[PDB]
Design a protein around this ligand. Structure first.
Ligand SMILES: COc1cc(CCNC(=O)c2nc(C(C)(C)NC(=O)OCc3ccccc3)[nH]c(=O)c2O)ccn1
Ligand SMILES: COc1cc(CCNC(=O)c2nc(C(C)(C)NC(=O)OCc3ccccc3)[nH]c(=O)c2O)ccn1
Ligand SMILES: COc1cc(CCNC(=O)c2nc(C(C)(C)NC(=O)OCc3ccccc3)[nH]c(=O)c2O)ccn1
Ligand SMILES: COc1cc(CCNC(=O)c2nc(C(C)(C)NC(=O)OCc3ccccc3)[nH]c(=O)c2O)ccn1
Ligand SMILES: COc1cc(CCNC(=O)c2nc(C(C)(C)NC(=O)OCc3ccccc3)[nH]c(=O)c2O)ccn1
Ligand SMILES: COc1cc(CCNC(=O)c2nc(C(C)(C)NC(=O)OCc3ccccc3)[nH]c(=O)c2O)ccn1
Ligand SMILES: COc1cc(CCNC(=O)c2nc(C(C)(C)NC(=O)OCc3ccccc3)[nH]c(=O)c2O)ccn1
Ligand SMILES: COc1cc(CCNC(=O)c2nc(C(C)(C)NC(=O)OCc3ccccc3)[nH]c(=O)c2O)ccn1
Ligand SMILES: [Mn+2]
Ligand SMILES: [Mn+2]
Ligand SMILES: [Mn+2]
Ligand SMILES: [Mn+2]
Ligand SMILES: [Mn+2]
Ligand SMILES: [Mn+2]
Ligand SMILES: [Mn+2]
Ligand SMILES: [Mn+2]
Ligand SMILES: [Mn+2]
Ligand SMILES: [Mn+2]
Ligand SMILES: [Mn+2]
Ligand SMILES: [Mn+2]
Ligand SMILES: [Mn+2]
Ligand SMILES: [Mn+2]
Ligand SMILES: [Mn+2]
Ligand SMILES: [Mn+2]
Lengths: 182, 182, 182, 182, 182, 182, 182, 182
């Protein structure tokens, strides 16, 4: 099954900075999928991590702690350290950020559907109330808990721009349609 | 026609940082002029890019997206990503920045004439209304749409200083007069 | 007595950035204990320095001068320079920071007991009044003079998180209990 | 099963340079074992790669091509490129080096047994004749095909030294005995 | 005509080191073809430069002067400097190396045909006698003037290996057949 | 006259960062004194430049333009660029900074006397009114035009601290008294 | 006793590269003398280490293993690894190099006396026969076991040059005479 | 007299690597000429130093000690260290290299005349016999004592090539004729 290369893989290495590429390869292999086979899930993991990093970059100095991109065990270690210091309740599943100005965890989703339908899926997949949720699509829409978008207009806007240019650079190498599906 | 060297070329490499030098060589070759022949247009492209970079540096954190200095195709890709996210109308010609605090594209001109006369030329060359315009000269004048200079006094002042010192370092190697013409 | 290695030493090098590791080795050897023998005091010195650095990082631009992590003689040199410039009285023992927004020295303690009991010990060990005191524990509590925590909620919170994750990474290699004792 | 840490893991990160550490994590995850669980196999993979690198470093300029430390697919890609250029027959299993001065592939083994018994196992595991074999132990013995040790006394000697010091640094953290077993 | 991307371009950036990539973009634009359109000629220019660099790397200390990868004018400048110092006759067309141990220029060709047929084409395209010629193919054959291969078996062998692995990494992304043609 | 070394020179290289050391050697040689002979004037030039750099670092983003540490000709070039852009009058002698928030040049003096007596000397040496003046001593005093200290308490305080620690590190190598004189 | 500075210390930091400076501070503190008090022994330790490094640099590729400059425990670890691999007998005291071309340990002395008298002292201080001995002085003499100088004329000559220039740079800061004594 | 720029200065910074540029500025200022006025002597000093560096690079490992490019005092310090170690007689004037394989100092001249006439001038300017002499011109000729060219054909050939290309890059900016004169 494992091939020598692939269009999607070449594009993923061309399009994203090498650091988030290694981090995505690692997140995937830690859960048992091969980056070079499930290449659409590879592109998805890279986009998700890049969005998480821009989001953490969008705030004040050290407003966020980054939970995504670490190994699961260290991830949970930091989750426990945050809970047993703030007092917030240990969530059921791993968030992507903790947000100290507003004292809450954040799940970040990136979707090729309607912000409504993923938000439905992930909101009742969480069903933990406390943890905030924030969705972007490849079209430029977002959707957040209590319509509380956590960041400023300009940063969220930079995330939307980046998602749209990624979609255009998948459409140029007719990889967009295969990617949309899933 | 292509020579081994040239005074203007030596001065351009001495005077500007290497990165914007490579970017200018590339902008020029992409449109079919040789940096080592049209050397005055070389110095012009380097000055224009440096001003664009100082301008983008003049604002808050990531207030600007830089459109100039990219390849035309990627340039247009980012323009489409910005339009299809903000809602602003896709301009007719490539701007130099997008400005998210104020939600608009910016053309930056640098002129060896009167800010009035270039502003006339470029304003009705654009004739797109929406896109903002901002002119500096090698004398220290500026002119902007709605007299809205977008940045603070101090940054614009730093751009004027740099333009004047460039003009002095062209006058020392009697390259200024040839440059003025065109 | 001096061994070839040790679990605590391997963990200290794995867990802390190399710079504060060298600084801690140096603080210890300057007072006559071998990092590779007194390994619990090694981990303590590394934690204390890391907390001092995060604390100095928590403020505005250059709000703090770092006194800890220098050699004792240079340390006292900077203490004299601060006193003979501000006017504040030369403390009896070396603080960890000077804090210019609030014009005072700061001792930072890190404890595996109750903030109350260490605060007692160090507060009457100081008995200099003027110098501020600030304690963190490996549980997430703090205690400060005049309940004046000097920094913002978010930064202190980041220090508590880091202390708790250090405690978890000592508990995973059953080194926590030995460490607690002392 | 997956823990927060481990003595063997801390030692492996302390003892080997980070590059071969990442390469070993990757070789292991590519075949489905978790570096943080099978920690003895982790230390084994790191030792094996370091020996392969010193071996390739032992020769003239670019005498060797390194086959070990690449992904399996690229590994086989380079094997095919070597075969279809030299004329040597495509081996049944992946070697560790190709050796151009002597025109042959090399398997490198590192053993905690007798060079005789591993050499038996790996020699009839290969049973390909053409590919050379070269074994080192943690005691300082080696064994090679046709008693042709490929390198000079001094380099092989440096590999033996390094293996013995690794064994001493496992014995100091009483990890040696567990490691020996397997 | 100019697109947003392309499979061949993504592969060329994935497969070659960035430096020779920039150099190839520049060689091409200097003669008026766009790297992003004529992508097969892009891959060809990158392969040719990489082979030239490995060739220059194959000799003693500073045995070669590299003529390829410079701008045409500087290229000719170095050719004149070599002629007017050694005494060898100024060739009609730009070589790829000068070779000081053997006092002669070298053209290096890389072909997807028979070394015989390209050697015919380039040998009577040169028809300058003095300048040496050296051809490699993507199959592992070479052909040189006076059967004088200039380098040692091992280095030429490394060039053949690299060419074959490039051919395999074009065949994996079914770009090989399009590339062969031309 | 020129010696092989000197205590003051060794101390100057130990005490200051190499960049300002090279800049001071250059300022001195440009006016015809040898850093290795007039070593007290060497230490003075290094202290003066370091204070100028901390001062420029004390403000907002790019609030200052640094005039000191450049060659005299480029220095005057930047002075002309600032005048012919702001409108402020071209001073008689080279200042150390331009200050754009407050639109004025700044002379910075560092004295081993009373801020009053140097301020007298330099204020009527300037006698240009427009240019601001700012004096520090090695004791911790300052004195500024219109008692307008331009910066915040904390930054000026950091400059005083640094001056006092320099004085202590000259007193330790009994170089202070020789230095005081002059 | 511990001072703020010292002429010898400033000279030692000016004269030697920072790496061997840190290594010497560490060798000294490991045996209980303070670099800033016993400053002559500081200069001696730095000279000795620099000579050891030039010596190891004087041979082929990896002809030497460096024993000096490591911590005593790791030092002995490498000594055991060398003995239990080569077969040579474990010396009584720590050498400075192992020399694999000639299969023996080397003590390197650097003396301000006659090569004869130190050679006497260190040769019967060793009284281990097997370990080679090699002395240099600050005058340009050497003395070795079996008159076997291990290296080539040119390298030993470079070590003599460096020792003499160190002696001249101590004589310029009248530190030579104090240094000679001891 | 001191100007803002100059064609020759721009060319010197374009043509030579920055390190030898700083070294030449320093050699010149140490003897009292301003690099920006005597620009032809600037280009001469840069060419001379570059040739000295290529010459030292032409030999084995550390065959040469570089005397040129240091300050005069350190220069003489190294000359004394070499004499008082080898036994060769202290020359009257500063050479450019010492050459340990052949145990002698080397003056390197670079001339725009006949190797005969400079060799005459410098040979009886030296009149020290012992010190070797080696001249190159901008045409490709050399001349050495006892026709002993010290290096191999290939390296000297690389120095001739570089001199000729420098001459061509001065002729392109019609600076060659002014340079020739003097
Ligand atoms: C592929 O790796 C995993 C990870 C997990 C657990 C952790 N998952 C995430 O962190 C996560 N996974 C997503 C996905 C990509 C699922 N969709 N998207 C997020 O936004 C996200 O935060 C489960 C299954 N596979
Ligand atoms: C030389 O490159 C081009 C580019 C174009 C299209 C894009 N032009 C620009 O981006 C642009 N061109 C300018 C000029 C230098 C034209 N004047 N000045 C700007 O300020 C500017 O933004 C057309 C013709 N030649
Ligand atoms: C180990 O080094 C020293 C240093 C000293 C003097 C200076 N001590 C400190 O700076 C200091 N020492 C602590 C300790 C670790 C004591 N507990 N904790 C602080 O928070 C702290 O600031 C005395 C004895 N040993
Ligand atoms: C753990 O990774 C693998 C790899 C393979 C296939 C490739 N194996 C090797 O390259 C290899 N594996 C060894 C081992 C560590 C097996 N023993 N030792 C070598 O010296 C060696 O070269 C099979 C099973 N597991
Ligand atoms: C694309 O750039 C050029 C360059 C030239 C002139 C110089 N050409 C070369 O240097 C050159 N061109 C080749 C080609 C790729 C032609 N085939 N192959 C070599 O091996 C080679 O050395 C002419 C036309 N196009
Ligand atoms: C040593 O170099 C010079 C420079 C000059 C002209 C420029 N001088 C300065 O820039 C200057 N010189 C000072 C001094 C050190 C004079 N005192 N102190 C400043 O604060 C200062 O700004 C004149 C004479 N010698
Ligand atoms: C200062 O450190 C030590 C080290 C030791 C044991 C190890 N000594 C050495 O390695 C050593 N010590 C020397 C000296 C400087 C002693 N003379 N000189 C060598 O050439 C040398 O190799 C004993 C006492 N003090
Ligand atoms: C410009 O600097 C100096 C240096 C000196 C003394 C040292 N001179 C040299 O080192 C030297 N000077 C040359 C020159 C450039 C003189 N011709 N050429 C060499 O090849 C050379 O080695 C005397 C006068 N001016
Ligand atoms: Mn997640
Ligand atoms: Mn998520
Ligand atoms: Mn533009
Ligand atoms: Mn523009
Ligand atoms: Mn402290
Ligand atoms: Mn403390
Ligand atoms: Mn293998
Ligand atoms: Mn193997
Ligand atoms: Mn070519
Ligand atoms: Mn070619
Ligand atoms: Mn000044
Ligand atoms: Mn001043
Ligand atoms: Mn020793
Ligand atoms: Mn020794
Ligand atoms: Mn010279
Ligand atoms: Mn010379």
């Amino acid at each position: 099954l494992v091939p020598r290369g692939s269009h999607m893989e070449d594009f993923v290495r061309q399009c994203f900075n090498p650091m988030i590429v290694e981090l995505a390869e690692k997140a995937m292999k830690e859960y048992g999928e091969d980056p070079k086979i499930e290449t659409n899930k590879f592109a998805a993991t890279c986009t998700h991590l890049e969005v998480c990093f821009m989001y953490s970059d969008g705030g004040s100095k050290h407003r966020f702690e980054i939970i995504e991109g670490r190994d699961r065990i260290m991830a949970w270690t930091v989750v426990n350290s945050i809970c047993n210091t703030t007092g917030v309740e240990k969530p059921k599943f791993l968030p992507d950020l903790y947000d100290y100005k507003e004292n809450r965890f954040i799940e970040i989703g990136v979707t090729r559907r309607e912000v409504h339908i993923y938000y439905l899926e992930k909101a009742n997949k969480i069903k933990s109330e406390k943890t905030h949720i924030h969705i972007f699509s490849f079209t430029g829409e977002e959707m957040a808990t209590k319509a509380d978008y956590t960041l400023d207009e300009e940063s969220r806007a930079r995330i939307k721009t980046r998602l749209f240019t990624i979609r255009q650079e998948m459409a140029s190498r007719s990889l967009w349609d295969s990617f949309r599906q899933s």
